[PDB]
Amino acid sequence: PRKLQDLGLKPASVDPATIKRQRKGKITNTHMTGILKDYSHR
Amino acid sequence: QFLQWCTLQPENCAVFTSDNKEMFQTESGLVVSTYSMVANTRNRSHDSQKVMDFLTGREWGFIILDEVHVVPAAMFRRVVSTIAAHAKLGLTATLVREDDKIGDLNFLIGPKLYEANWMELSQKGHIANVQCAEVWCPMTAEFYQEYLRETARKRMLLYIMNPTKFQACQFLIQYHERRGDKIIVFSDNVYALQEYALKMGKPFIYGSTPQQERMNILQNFQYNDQINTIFLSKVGDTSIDLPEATCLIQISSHYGSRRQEAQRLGRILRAKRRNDEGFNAFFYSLVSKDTQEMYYSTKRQAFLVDQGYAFKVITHLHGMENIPNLAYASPRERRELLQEVLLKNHPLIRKMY
Amino acid sequence: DRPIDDIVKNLLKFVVRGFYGGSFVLVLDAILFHSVLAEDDLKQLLSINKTELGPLIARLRSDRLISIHKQREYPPNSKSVERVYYYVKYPHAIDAIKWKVHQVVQRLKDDLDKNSEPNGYMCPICLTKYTQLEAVQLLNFDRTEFLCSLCDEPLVEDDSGKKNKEKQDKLNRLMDQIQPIIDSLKKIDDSRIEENTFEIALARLIPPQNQSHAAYTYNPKKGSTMATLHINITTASDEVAQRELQERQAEEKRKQNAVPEWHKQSTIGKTALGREERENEKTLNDYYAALAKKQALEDEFEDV
Amino acid sequence: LQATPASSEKMMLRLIGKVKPQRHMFSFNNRTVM
Ligand SMILES: [Zn+2]
Question: Which residue of B has its CA nearest to C272?
Fold first, then answer.
């Protein structure tokens, strides 16, 4: 790609991969356990 | 609130806490901290020492003293002298104390600037329309008979655990849960909240509960519609984040502490169903008849009727005669509860030991 | 499908008929027809041998025409083998063709440049070349001939320079045969090329046969660091039903948001709390008819 | 009409009929196809 750009011929490819690229705790409401559903999000 | 409502960069904002002590490097910025950052006389960290030296050595033009009613305390009075600030704004919702030191905030902060009319904000849809109520629970015969020869702390321990308040709270939870109302039930005694929560199978949050439980149960009360009742301690009176509720029940109380009731009411006053027409938030102060509850609660509601709220007295609930589930209906169960309350109160030799 | 896919397929076909033999043509036509192919499927389709596909796969890998995939899957008989998959990367292939044709025309232009140089000299005994510059220092005392240093024999003139017109004819006869490639690359540059891979080239697969030993499902590895529309039609006869539903829902939410009875009423005085026209219309129709006569394998599933 | 989730590696489609329902299996190669 970049030596195509250096030679003036615009490339039709994206630059390849060789180019630089990127606890558990206790509970106290044991009387009704298994009812409280997990809320990891709103 | 600074990061969201105003154009303040996080590099201009800073935190002084136990975990966080790093500050802004700019010539002028902002820091939010706790009262006992500054006014603690205990042996502190060198980092906190350097921080408070920086705070003393920086001339401030403004201080926002939130919840100013605790400023007239003995340590918290000194924060306006240690921190030299030109302008002092005392922001609170409960400007009342049991002692007379609330009058000294004129010397601490300044003259009283603005009083917000509670009824005016209620009628125009800014704060909720609360229905303050006072449920009269008649004291049972055996409980009162044991109550007339008891010492004061055990007097509270007896009259908080009468079965008529049990039935009244059970019925109020049962009725307002059917109304789709989130309910927060306040009871300062740990034994009281635990007993009610084990009686009705409801969640309870007191002081020594784990914080992750106080978040999981909190989000279950917020979002899981199966849970609509949380029994809450004196921890809920102060500033902890809680979901929105439209009904409140007061089982026990910390004497006639005129700050606590408005702190409790401000939780219901933030109700999101405010803009709906016909909405009415509910407040209940469940008191035991012919016991010290009316003395304490009259001291409690003196502040609120000074603000203008009306506590409609309730001496009868429509539903005792036909309630599905009965708590301590039998005399034997009431008597068992009575005796329950009565019975309540060298490198190698190191391996050697 | 995609016209640009047709353009790159035509470009690959033209270059493989041009600069490649018939078996390379067969391999690339199999790849462009069946988008994803394996070694056993290619052997089944082309009847080619391993020692015969070896030069083919080596040449199309050296010329950067076929992308090879190293994936091993697990057959149910647990005889897992390292199967190879052959697919094509369109932007890499067109860039390879671009670079090859550019270096071809650069090499032949350099040949045309260097053939304009004069003939030079060459000694038939030692068979060593000489340019024009060092022919002068090999000139003898007779000032006529160029004597070799090692052979001591007069040099003869190399036949280079008279083929300059031959190189020009070769250049033109190459370039009139490459103009469709020029037009295809112009059309490609006037458009956009989407960079595909094995997972993307599997979208347009054509099955070679019914029973292929090489599966076409990618197996991921961990730790490798290399909606609906529903309508409701009413015949102008059932609108009362949902308007009744609307009003009963309205009164239901009014009752749910209603003030309770002990709030709106005093609880003091009450007790303390504790523990036939069918024949008519038929005869009418008969009368009107008479009047008209007178007048005239199990796994997880989700529903959708 | 039954489908497999995209997280599952096992790739299957099933059709449930009406009147002993007729059940047919449909294994595909690409996920955008399903
Ligand atoms: Zn020679």
Answer: B316
Please tell me the distance between residue C152's alpha carbon and the centre of ligand 1 in angstroms.
6
What is the four-CA torsion angle of B150, B153, B156, B159, rounded to 10 degrees?
Answer: -20
Tokens of C256: 């749910």
Other Cβ atoms within 10 Å of B99 Cβ, number: 9
Residues of B in contact with C271 (CB under 8 A): 316
Identify the helix (H) or strand (E) that includes residue C26: helix C22-33
Across the interface, of C254, C260, C267, the residue whose CB is closest to B175 is C260
CA closest to C255 among chain B residues: B179
Taking the CA of residue B220 and the nearest CA in chain A, the distance in Å comes to: 7
What's this structure's resolution in Å? 6.6
Joined together, the tokens standing for residue B338 give 């009575």
Answer for the pair B320, C273: CB distance below 8 angstroms, yes or no: yes
Going along chain B, which residue ranges are E strands?
Answer: 13-16, 30-33, 60-66, 85-91, 130-138, 183-186, 204-205, 229-232, 247-250, 281-289, 312-314
Nearest to D4 among C217, C300, C303 (CB): C300
- Give the method of determination: cryo-EM
Element (H, E) at B337: helix B331-344
| Angstrom distance (rounded) from CA B253 to CA B185 | 11
Rounded distance between C-alpha atoms, residue D27 and residue C13, angstroms:
32
